[PDB]
Design a protein around this motif. Sequence first.
Motif, short mmCIF file in Angstrom:
data_model
loop_
_atom_site.label_atom_id
_atom_site.label_comp_id
_atom_site.label_asym_id
_atom_site.label_seq_id
_atom_site.Cartn_x
_atom_site.Cartn_y
_atom_site.Cartn_z
N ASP A 201 85.81 80.77 70.97
CA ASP A 201 84.51 80.45 70.38
C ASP A 201 84.47 81.04 68.98
O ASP A 201 85.21 81.98 68.68
N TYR A 202 83.58 80.53 68.14
CA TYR A 202 83.45 80.97 66.75
C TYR A 202 82.01 80.88 66.25
O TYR A 202 81.23 80.04 66.70
N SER A 203 81.64 81.77 65.32
CA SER A 203 80.32 81.84 64.69
C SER A 203 80.43 81.48 63.22
O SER A 203 81.17 82.13 62.49
N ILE A 204 79.65 80.51 62.74
CA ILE A 204 79.71 80.08 61.35
C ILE A 204 79.32 81.23 60.41
O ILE A 204 79.93 81.40 59.36
N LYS A 205 78.34 82.05 60.81
CA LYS A 205 77.84 83.18 60.01
C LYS A 205 78.56 84.51 60.25
O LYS A 205 78.76 85.25 59.30
N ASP A 206 78.97 84.83 61.48
CA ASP A 206 79.68 86.09 61.76
C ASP A 206 81.19 86.00 61.50
O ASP A 206 81.84 87.03 61.32
N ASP A 207 81.77 84.79 61.48
CA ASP A 207 83.18 84.50 61.19
C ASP A 207 84.21 85.08 62.18
O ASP A 207 85.40 85.17 61.87
N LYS A 208 83.79 85.51 63.37
CA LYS A 208 84.70 86.00 64.42
C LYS A 208 85.34 84.85 65.20
O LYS A 208 84.72 83.80 65.37
N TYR A 209 86.48 85.13 65.81
CA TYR A 209 87.00 84.41 66.97
C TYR A 209 86.79 85.26 68.22
O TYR A 209 87.14 86.44 68.24
N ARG A 210 86.18 84.70 69.25
CA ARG A 210 85.44 85.47 70.26
C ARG A 210 85.95 85.23 71.68
O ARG A 210 85.18 84.79 72.53
N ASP B 109 83.50 70.69 67.56
CA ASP B 109 83.58 72.16 67.61
C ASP B 109 84.35 72.74 66.43
O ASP B 109 85.00 72.00 65.69
#
Length: 224
Positions: free
Chosen positions: A158-167, A188
């Motif tokens: 998973d990924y966050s457009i604003k936090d830039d992590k791979y989760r 996605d």
Amino acid sequence: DLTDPEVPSFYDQVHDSYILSVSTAYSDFEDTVVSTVAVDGYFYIFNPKDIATTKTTVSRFRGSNLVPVVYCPQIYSYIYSDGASSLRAVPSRAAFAVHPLVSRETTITAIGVSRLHPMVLAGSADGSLIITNAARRLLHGIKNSSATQKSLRLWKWDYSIKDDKYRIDSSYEVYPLTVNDVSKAKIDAHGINITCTKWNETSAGGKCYAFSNSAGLLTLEYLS
DNA sequence: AGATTGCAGCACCTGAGTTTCGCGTATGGTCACCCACTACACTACTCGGTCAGGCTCTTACCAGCTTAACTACAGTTGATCGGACG
């Protein structure tokens, strides 16, 4: 011929456009048939002895620009993505016997299988990685297929457009077999799609598998 | 080896993914009618000049006279004019 690479043994037309994947269904008891899929959407099985006298059709898909196809040698069945969002099995000697294995909300992009066991790994472009036993579908009765065959999610990127992590999420989820299901196409994050997935096939390494997303996050696990 | 029970095979009612469809709603396209503007050639009534008709005003008288000015005869002097000069 790898010994005589100057000229091919044959050069025959079999598709209308770009042939995406070719796969060999070897057997100790039948001819070495070959399967092919292309952007024209046809899935053809044929014998290289004579294509014109043997060519056979399994399906026509919607034209799709990545179609994973693999051979599961433990159950003499090809395993394929329908170019949309379902995983299906077809025995090399009964092309009409298409059995759907699993449904996903986003396209199946990579598939892996081994010579020692019937466990199929499939990765969708939603970052989900699923495991399922193909032999439980192929070697058993049709009647209770909607409940007797199931699948498990081994991991999810998973990924966050604003936090830039791979989760990466370790949580296991069980998905039962929706037989009459619709094809789906949820968009996605670009990096979280799964680009390859393969089991090690030695006896010592046979419980080990490797998979990759498209950002670069190659991942391996020993199933113990 | 029978009383209790599951597998699973048969058949028929049923359900959705998928398709073809009918309509709304609205849009570009046919084409038929009749309107507006323009204009070359025309219609026709009036105004205008010219003419006659014939009614009309106003003149100025005949010779003589008797109230009024010219209209010729007449003499030294101008200054353009010819035609030749510079």
